[PDB]
Amino acid sequence: MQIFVKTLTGKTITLEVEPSDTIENVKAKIQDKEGIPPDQQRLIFAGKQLEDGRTLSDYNIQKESTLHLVLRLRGGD
Amino acid sequence: MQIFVKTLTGKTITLEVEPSDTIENVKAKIQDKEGIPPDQQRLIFAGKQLEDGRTLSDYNIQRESTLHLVLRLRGG
Amino acid sequence: QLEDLRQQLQQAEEALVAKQELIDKLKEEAEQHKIVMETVPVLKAQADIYKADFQAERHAREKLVEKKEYLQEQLEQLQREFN
Amino acid sequence: LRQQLQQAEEALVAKQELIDKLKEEAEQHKIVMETVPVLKAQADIYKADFQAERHAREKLVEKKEYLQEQLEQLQREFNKLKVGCH
Numbered sequence: 480m481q482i483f484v485k486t487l488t489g490k491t492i493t494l495e496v497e498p499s500d501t502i503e504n505v506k507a508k509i510q511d512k513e514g515i516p517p518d519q520q521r522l523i524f525a526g527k528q529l530e531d532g533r534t535l536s537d538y539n540i541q542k543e544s545t546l547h548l549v550l551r552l553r554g555g556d
Numbered sequence: 557m558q559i560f561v562k563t564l565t566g567k568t569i570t571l572e573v574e575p576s577d578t579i580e581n582v583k584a585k586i587q588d589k590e591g592i593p594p595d596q597q598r599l600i601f602a603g604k605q606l607e608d609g610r611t612l613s614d615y616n617i618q619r620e621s622t623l624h625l626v627l628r629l630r631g632g
Numbered sequence: 633q634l635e636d637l638r639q640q641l642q643q644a645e646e647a648l649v650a651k652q653e654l655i656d657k658l659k660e661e662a663e664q665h666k667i668v669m670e671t672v673p674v675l676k677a678q679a680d681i682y683k684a685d686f687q688a689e690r691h692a693r694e695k696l697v698e699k700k701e702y703l704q705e706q707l708e709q710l711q712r713e714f715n
Numbered sequence: 716l717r718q719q720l721q722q723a724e725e726a727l728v729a730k731q732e733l734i735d736k737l738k739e740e741a742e743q744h745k746i747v748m749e750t751v752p753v754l755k756a757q758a759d760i761y762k763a764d765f766q767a768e769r770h771a772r773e774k775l776v777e778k779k780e781y782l783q784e785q786l787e788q789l790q791r792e793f794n795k796l797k798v799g800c801h
Contacts (some may be wrong), residue, residue: 499780542632564674598681603673624674629685629765637716644723651730658737665744672747675754682761689765693772700779707786714793 480542482535484509484522487549496535498542503531509548518556523547557619559612561586561599564626573612580608586625596631600624 484492484505494508506517522529524538524546540546557575561582562568571585583594599606601615601623617623 564671564678598677600674600677603677605677626674626678626681628681629762630688632688637720641716641720641723644720644727647727648723648730651727651734655730655734655737658734658741662737662741662744665741665748668748668751669744671751672754675751675758678758679754679761682758682765686761686765686768689768689772693768693775696772696775696779700775700782703779703782703786707782707789710786710789710793714789 482540482543483545484548485545486547498535498540501531501534502529505529505535506531515550519550519554521549521551523549559617559620560622561625562622564624575613575617576611578609578611579606582612582623583608592627593631596628598626598628600626 480496480498482494482496482505484494492509492513494505494512496505496508502522503517506520506522509515509520510517517531524540524544527538529538529546535544557573559571559573560568561571569586569589571582573582573585579599580594582599583597586592586597587594601617601621604615606615606623612621
């Protein structure tokens with residue numbers, strides 16, 4: 480299925496994923512498509528931050544769902 | 557106003573709709589009482605599959621008009 | 633000459649009662665036909681939908697085939713470099 | 716009485732012209748109706764192919780999900796070992 484990762488800034492990136500993929504996988508797909516470190520990516524769906532462990536399935540994130548990306552300021556890790 | 561939604565099985569239910577209601581809505585009124593997902597629904601009227609955006613009024617569906625339902629197997 | 637025309641008319645009473653009754657018999661059938669004929673556009677639509685659903689599954693699978701032979705051929709290189 | 720006949724003649728005539736219209740119309744119908752059972756058959760056939768295409772896809776999913784977990788565990792070996800050498 481396809482999802483949309485939008486930023487408050489306004490940018491929108493579409494992704495090709497599967498309801499079995501792990502939030503970790505995605506933060507990695509975003510890096511490949513936008514060259515952005517996953518250790519800096521916070522994903523938001525239904526007002527909650529997504530953990531690299533769970534999967535879209537757990538968060539009932541269906542096809543064409545919209546996700547948000549907020550980058551952490553630390554970077555220190 | 558009131559309309560009918562029929563399956564080829566013969567089953568016939570009724571929905572309370574407004575002439576300005578979209579196909580998208582009607583599908584959602586079918587999920588509420590039949591539990592059928594809207595993305596697996598295909599509604600037919602006058603030998604034509606109907607489109608989500610158009611309204612009943614657009615295809616000119618009056619009261620007690622009979623629409624036909626057919627379901628997908630995959631449903632995207 | 634009376635019974636003649638009289639009999640020639642009584643052969644028209646039933647004559648029209650025969651066709652009217654018949655005509656009525658045929659209208660009741662044209663109605664049963666129209667009921668069944670409304671099904672056709674619906675059944676044809678069903679065929680296409682099951683057809684399109686078939687293709688989607690095929691395509692969907694066909695790609696899962698090319699991503700599984702790419703995941704297996706790459707695993708060939710995770711063992712190679714490994715040792 | 717003669718005028719009473721002529722009105723039964725011209726009347727029965729066209730009344731026949733109407734019966735011949737409902738019959739040549741019924742033949743058009745029958746030809747269309749003779750297709751209903753075939754259309755159902757077709758529906759089932761296609762449905763079947765689908766299901767078949769589904770099990771083939773469903774099974775071809777386990778075959779793949781087994782390589783992932785596998786390639787993953789077999790990645791820990793290639794990862795956890797190389798780091799130990801340096």
